[PDB]
Each structure stands twice: as C-alpha cells, then as structure tokens.
Amino acid sequence: LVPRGSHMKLCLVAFDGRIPMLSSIVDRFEEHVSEYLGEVKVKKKRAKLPEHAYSKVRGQYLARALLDTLRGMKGEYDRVLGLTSEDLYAPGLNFVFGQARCPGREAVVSVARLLDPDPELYLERVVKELTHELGHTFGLGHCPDRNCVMSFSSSLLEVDRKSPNFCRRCTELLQRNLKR
Numbered sequence: 001l002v003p004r005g006s007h008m009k010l011c012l013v014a015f016d017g018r019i020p021m022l023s024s025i026v027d028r029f030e031e032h033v034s035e036y037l038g039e040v041k042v043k044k045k046r047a048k049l050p051e052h053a054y055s056k057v058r059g060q061y062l063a064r065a066l067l068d069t070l071r072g073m074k075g076e077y078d079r080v081l082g083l084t085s086e087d088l089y090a091p092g093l094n095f096v097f098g099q100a101r102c103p104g105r106e107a108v109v110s111v112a113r114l115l116d117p118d119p120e121l122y123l124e125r126v127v128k129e130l131t132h133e134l135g136h137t138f139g140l141g142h143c144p145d146r147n148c149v150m151s152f153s154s155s156l157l158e159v160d161r162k163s164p165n166f167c168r169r170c171t172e173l174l175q176r177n178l179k180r
C-alpha cells in the first residue's frame with residue numbers, strides 16, 4: 001500500500017561490463033540518495049555504447065550521446081542514470097565525469113577517471129558523481145559550496161574534497177523541486 005509516487009524509480013544502466021564494483025556502486029548510490037529522495041527502487045540495466053559518439057582520436061564518447069541512448073530506453077523510470085567505464089567528454093571539454101539533463105530524466109557518469117585502487121575511495125567518488133548528476137536532473141545547478149556534492153568538479157582533487165551530500169541550500173532546492 002505504498003503511497004503512489006513515494007518510490008522514485010531509478011534505473012542504473014551499465015554501458016559496459018568493465019565497471020569495477022558495479023553492484024557496490026548501485027547499492028551505495030541507492031542507499032545514499034534515499035536520504036534525499038526517500039527509499040528508492042533501483043533497477044539495473046545494460047545499454048550499448050553509441051559508437052557514433054565515439055571519438056577515435058579522443059578515445060572518448062560524447063556524454064550527451066549516452067544520455068540520448070538512455071533517453072531511448074524502454075521502461076518507466078523517474079531517472080535513468082548510466083554508468084560507463086569509458087571516458088566521456090562534452091564539446092569543448094577535455095573530459096567529463098558525467099553529464100545530466102538539467103533538469104531531465106537521464107544522467108550518466110563515467111568511472112574511467114574515478115578509478116582508484118582504494119575501493120572505498122572509488123565507491124565514494126562514483127557515488128558522489130552519480131549524486132551530482134542526479135542533482136542536475138532535479139534542476140540543481142552548480143553549488144558555490146565546495147563541500148557540496150553539487151560543487152562542480154573537473155578533477156579528482158575536487159571530487160574528493162567535496163562531500164557526497166547536498167549542502168543545506170541544495171537539499172532545500174532539491175526538496176523544493178521534488179515537491180513537484
């Protein structure tokens with residue numbers, strides 16, 4: 001008898017089979033974001049990388065193309081978040097850790113640059129960037145608070161410095177945007 005719409009349906013989509021600790025990522029991300037979204041129902045899926053979006057010179061995929069791929073996926077999900085071990089970029093950036101529709105349904109994170117031998121560090125990074133991109137899907141922009149997960153990170157240093165949590169302001173924004 002769960003109140004209709006009280007369970008956000010998240011789809012975590014693995015774009016390849018080389019994502020380290022995928023199951024831990026999904027478990028941790030699910031637990032983590034539940035603080036903000038409530039108990040979330042996660043579903044794991046696969047998707048094919050869009051080869052047209054692969055830059056052979058860069059050895060990277062255009063993140064937006066992965067979002068388009070996610071957008072094209074069947075299923076009723078409130079959010080579809082992709083993970084890949086392939087490196088991503090966006091036009092005019094050397095790389096991105098991820099990208100999201102802002103706001104919108106899809107986000108994608110690459111673990112390619114988040115890899116670390118330390119599993120806890122790695123998992124925290126992936127959870128952070130998934131949470132960051134998830135924030136964007138809820139219309140959150142970048143947060144000036146460098147400890148906020150919505151802080152824009154363009155390096156590991158920056159990912160590692162910020163918390164996986166939304167700051168006071170972003171939590172309020174996110175709940176405000178969730179109210180809808």
Ligand SMILES: [Zn+2]
Nearest residue numbers: 132136142152
């Ligand atoms: Zn961002």
Ligand SMILES: [Zn+2]
Nearest residue numbers: 143148167170
């Ligand atoms: Zn914030």
